[PDB]
């Protein structure tokens, strides 16, 4: 078995190997990349996502989210307080202000230490989940606005045509903005490109060990666990690397820099934080190997997780027994 320790793998495709997206994902899996839950892909030196980022300031962040923490430094939840709309140029100025800017630091490890020590004492503002794309239409390779859709993959594998569309989302971050422990909707893959700015640090649990993370989470967030049998779908819980190590949970970490892609694999729990002002683009995708994960994905039916239009067909076709209860939670 390839990659039996479930290490995060880093790939350097040539421009020739960068032509066929599906083929390269399948290659990475042939080398065991999925066992980690996360891989990094450094694009060939000839590739670019677009010519410049000089003209993005007028994008609107209609609902910036202030991420308010509760708990202890290594075990906390966050809630999202909606703020008034602002442009990307306004948000960048705010990220660089004395109140919100990255502190002085020696290196990524020192900054990681400072994040886990001090995150809970601040409430950074995240421009998350904005429908749109920064890939130039003329970028032919790994253009996250031109990937094959999940509905087309399901139809190709299973023969059933379904409603729904599959589009990318932009994330404008600042120091200490945080993504909570989660897997993707329906345990899909995700791909994330860091277009510009400061880094993003990721933590990930191998898919074969995801249930160990879930059992710890139920212990650490006992009221939330009684409320819902899949409360990690709410995307609000944080657990530090130190707490994971104390509880013997297998995980890995890596820092993504501007110009690099990350892929998360089905049922790969992940969490992380931004180092300073940045912009990422991400989308979900599927492969033939996903179908079995989609059929077994947990679901929130308490009402909290509330998701997209396109998830309805996935539940309805892959999980018909769960459909009625899940839909009640959606409505
Ligand atoms: O970048 C973020 O805030 C969160 N991204 C992801 O969870 C992802 O790309 O799957
Ligand atoms: Mg603009
Ligand atoms: Ni994700
Ligand atoms: Zn729930």
Description:
Residues 136-302 form the JmjC domain. Belongs to the JHDM3 histone demethylase family. Keywords: ADP-ribosylation, Chromatin regulator, Dioxygenase, Iron, Metal-binding, Nucleus, Oxidoreductase, Transcription, Transcription regulation, Ubl conjugation, Zinc. It is found in: Nucleus. GO terms for molecular function: chromatin DNA binding; damaged DNA binding; histone demethylase activity; histone H3K9 demethylase activity; histone H3K9me2/H3K9me3 demethylase activity; metal ion binding. The chain is an alpha+beta fold and 331 residues long. The chain has a single domain (1-331), classed as Jelly Rolls (Sandwich), CATH 2.60.120.650. 26% of the residues lie in helices and 26% in strands. The chain contains 10 helices and 16 strands. The chain has helices at residues 21-30, 88-95, 108-118, 150-158, 210-220, 222-227, 241-246, 290-296, 311-318, 320-330, and strands at 9-11, 38-41, 60-61, 65-72, 75-82, 86-87, 125-131, 169-173, 178-182, 189-197, 200-205, 237-239, 252-256, 261-264, 269-274, 278-285. Strands 1-2-14-10-16-8-7-4-5-12 form a 10-stranded mixed beta sheet. Strands 9-15-11-13 form a 4-stranded antiparallel beta sheet, covered by helices on one side. α9 runs antiparallel to α10. It is globular, with a radius of gyration of 19 Å. It starts with 8 loop residues before the first strand and ends with a helix. Bound molecules: N-oxalylglycine (OGA), magnesium ion, nickel (II) ion (NI) and zinc ion.
